Amino acid sequence: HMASMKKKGSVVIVGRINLSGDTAYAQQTRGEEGCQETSQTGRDKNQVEGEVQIVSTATQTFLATSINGVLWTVYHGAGTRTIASPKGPVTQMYTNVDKDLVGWQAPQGSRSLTPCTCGSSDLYLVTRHADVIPVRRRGDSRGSLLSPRPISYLKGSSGGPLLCPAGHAVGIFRAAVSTRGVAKAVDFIPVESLETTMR
Ligand SMILES: COc1ccc2nc(C)c(O[C@@H]3C[C@H]4C(=O)N[C@]5(C(=O)NS(=O)(=O)C6(C)CC6)C[C@H]5/C=C\CCCCC[C@H](NC(=O)OC(C)(C)C(F)(F)F)C(=O)N4C3)nc2c1
Ligand SMILES: [Zn+2]
Prior knowledge:
Elements: E1 12-18, E2 25-28, H1 32-41, E3 52-56, E4 61-67, E5 70-73, H2 75-78, E6 94-96, E7 101-105, E8 122-126, E9 132-137, E10 142-150, E11 161-163, E12 169-179, E13 182-190, H3 191-197
Antiparallel strand pairs: 1-2, 1-3, 3-4, 4-5, 5-7, 6-7, 8-9, 8-11, 9-10, 10-13, 11-12, 12-13
Bound molecules: ligand GKG and zinc ion.
Zinc ion binds next to loops.
């Protein structure tokens, strides 16, 4: 029954993690009803700001992080969806299910993190609740939480950044390594993997 086949809506920016000042905090920029409408039309005329966006579909909410002029997030949250923009839906410019990674051109007014070249293993994970969690790098795509916490505190933070001491992007949060519901480590997409996807 082709005529009745539905179309999936767009990912919608519904807020951000404000890191401009000395205090990190989450801001909501669009409520549920407006989100639903924006998802169907793909038309989002709200001003975008900052590096870390809170994004939503009709069924999920997670994060998206701007690096090198691309807004990146996880495939398991966004799938192949478009993202809403002032002039209509924007198609992904990167999609890699093997890495759990997608990307769209960064929205006008967003700011981009710089890829980290420090080679440091003292990292910081930014969650959708604006918590800044110290993480020690343990491999190319793994880092341990200095203070483990239940997975409930990390749920909905896929697509968020791991940052170096200087605030450069080191990776994109992908999955939690949990033992009996406690997240002792995180799996992330290295920024180097993003830079390779960009070419
Ligand atoms: C459908 O096409 C694809 C393609 C590639 C995929 N690649 C992967 C890796 C994949 O994993 C999926 C999705 C992901 C996930 O839940 N992420 C997070 C998230 O917040 N999500 S989310 O924002 O709430 C939302 C669900 C809305 C979007 C940060 C997590 C917060 C809390 C943990 C909850 C408990 C789940 C633990 C599980 N642990 C785990 O698998 O660890 C492995 C890898 C064994 C290792 F080795 F690390 F131990 C886990 O984290 N996850 C299972 N799904 C894929 C799907
Ligand atoms: Zn750095």
